[PDB]
Symmetry: D2
Subunit: 249 residues, 4 copies
């Protein structure tokens, strides 16, 4: 077979072989050497080793190589084993994160009067976010358009409720499918959450378990909401930071 | 002291979920008031359903040990830990022997590959040229009914030809009709072939290709000639990625 | 060939072919049809499934069993991913339990007079006991034979030290190899360890971290020690606990 | 505030390791005492060389950012944990690639075996009958000398035969000698064989033995008769798990 065509498949290179000359390195047995090699190019063996692997021995001896390429498998799975126990280490090292996460989450006491939000009202609370943010600038009378609230009122049933909306001047028309919620005048303990939305809840568990009791604050069955703003870049980006406004006495 | 709706906001759950949890005697608390100190003893539940563990083996733990004994609740999940890895460890060895059985069904037919001998005269085939099968066969299908002079339109040719490839996807033609742009036409000469019927997909014929030239010619007893190889896509072929396909590979012979 | 020969090669039972009689499941064509079955049943499949999955077929036909076996790889593989995710979370879950026992690691203040310990002493720590426990009743005149002590004198260089001994009435001879150490009188804060031996240092940072400071104690550079009584049956059994006696002012 | 000695102690490390760390300016705090708030900073530094993170990567993570900010190091760790499982995955699909070459290795000799044709008369040999090879293929060797009337001593046999299995690893003997105890004798009759000098190991034969009755007799055209087959050890054989040794196998032929 000629030199130009003996470049089988599928990505060359031709001098691939001319390379494979120098002091080293259509016969039918002048292939299985290449066949074995080609993967090989799946183990990444230097060539100089792949010369040592010439006739001293061996030429072919698929005999040896069956134990050889699983002796490796022994090495390469020990490589996988070492990096997995490194990974298992990691998953535990990423626990010291959560509880330093929280011990630094300080509370600031904020009193804010009654204001009026307009937005969409509630299976999930994320969805509304999926559904609402094409309807952003459909609302006029904005104080600050960057901030948005995730209102949650405690009904005497008791069962959920949430509204994704914006603080707006009261007196403007509300679009179809939206609702006007009037947040009353409350005074809040504000926690800065630094994480994603599903682990906002595990911050809520830290609040109502001890983080309020270490500063002597008592929780209040009022209107909880989370303060979104410019320091917010995604619900599952583990770098967003929100403020959780939690009512107190 | 908190209420059933605040815990729902805390845990992202249903009020019926806890109203059910009260009925069993699991997590009890008209004035339903829960203690903030038992918020963890609950999350030490809502962390086990997330580990599909049934909801009365818990309630059996609640009084053997253990739900409230923290040195006991890591023994239980470290056993569930190692249970899951051995499940994973079973199924990763399931995967190891899942591949070694994707090579022996590889090389089974390759041996059982059928072979005809056809000597075919020189013919002309117009088409497009040169990244793989599909990089040239879609930019064709919409340009196959604009080709005139076709001998058989239900057969297509994939020609294999300094030393670079000259792969041409085209149609056998009767001469005297012209070729569009930027189509080309290739002179395939009169030669003798070993046609091997391949039953599979486009990525896995290139192993059907090195198999012949490997030991398949010899064992069949024929010698390769330096000419022009090519694949033959008959009717019997239905898509380059359909596995139940059937193509032909024509290989020059001395 | 015979129903004998038909019973060779594969690690086969006679019950398996009496099995396959009235089910519907003597020529070298019946050699791979019955060899792909010992190829999936190597991957935990059903059987009656692949019954008529071969009277349609494929009987053999490896064009299909390709997508199928890659189908099955998917399925598996999905399983293996799904259960790593559980282990990942599952790790995270053992954090809380880590701290719940730390938060419940109460200090005890204990004043103990100067007592006499003798055993072995010293670039490692854990290998010291496997040589000593054998030599355990060599020692004579011990107060409580059940309690070992892992002493760690504080040297002022600071070079370590460490002794694994018993407490005996002074004046008893001391087997070759071991020495006698006198710890002085001190008052200590005692923290009970629930866990294993490489976990012991995990408590040592928490103690010298915040656990002394909230309890309003100051620690003093002296002779600390680890105390093993029964409630200890293995440096790896995770249910033994050791009382870490730390000096305080 | 603390002492270099008890610090070290609580981290279960050495003191020269902390004087290691100080000299650079990394963890820099004659009576140098350190405050306890630097403990958790070191439980985060010592937790990074368990990840084999260079001891300079950091420091630049020190006065730059960011070693003690709990959300921008979960970033770090999140990446590093990606490329860690990205490296798993490389290999993890590579040892799916090799572990699928576990069959390609095979068939190449299997196709390039050899088969002589022998006709042999009935013989006899004895040892122990039927726990695999090694559970019997080893009791012996200390009992090879008990037999007398060895025919060729460099040659050992493993016979296979209402119906089930029936191995026996013997030697060929001239008749008229005492067979030990509880050793026994076996008589294979005069029959037709084809000999495949396998070049592998003893666990490796069971599918080379599977290959020959599968198709190799049909390719070579031979056919088997309901008799007794066996395997032949010679100067060839070197070890039951020795790869490079070649062993021969006798199967009945018509």
């Amino acid at each position: 077979l000629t030199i130009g065509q003996l470049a089988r498949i599928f990505e060359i290179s031709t001098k691939t072989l001319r390379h494979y000359d120098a002091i080293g390195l259509y016969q039918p047995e002048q292939i299985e050497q290449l066949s074995r090699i080609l993967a090989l190019r799946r183990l990444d063996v230097p060539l100089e080793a792949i010369d040592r692997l010439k006739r001293d021995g061996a030429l072919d001896d698929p005999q040896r190589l069956r134990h050889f390429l699983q002796r490796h498998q022994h090495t390469l799975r020990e490589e996988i084993s070492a990096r997995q126990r490194l990974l298992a280490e990691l998953d535990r090292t990423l626990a010291t994160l959560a509880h330093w996460r929280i011990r630094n989450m300080h509370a600031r006491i904020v009193e804010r009067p009654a204001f009026s939000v307009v937005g969409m009202e509630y299976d999930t609370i994320g969805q509304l976010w999926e559904r609402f943010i094409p309807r952003e600038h459909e609302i006029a009378g904005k104080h600050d358009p960057e901030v948005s609230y995730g209102i949650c009122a405690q009904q005497p049933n008791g069962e959920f409720h949430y509204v994704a909306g914006f603080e707006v001047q009261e007196g403007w028309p509300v679009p179809e499918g939206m609702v006007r919620f009037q947040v009353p005048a409350q005074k809040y303990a504000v926690f800065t959450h630094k994480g994603t939305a599903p682990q906002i809840a595990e911050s809520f568990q830290a609040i109502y378990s001890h983080l309020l009791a270490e500063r002597g604050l008592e929780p209040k069955a009022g209107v909880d909401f989370e303060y979104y703003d410019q320091r917010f870049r995604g619900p599952l980006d583990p770098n967003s930071q929100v403020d959780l406004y939690i009512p107190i006495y």
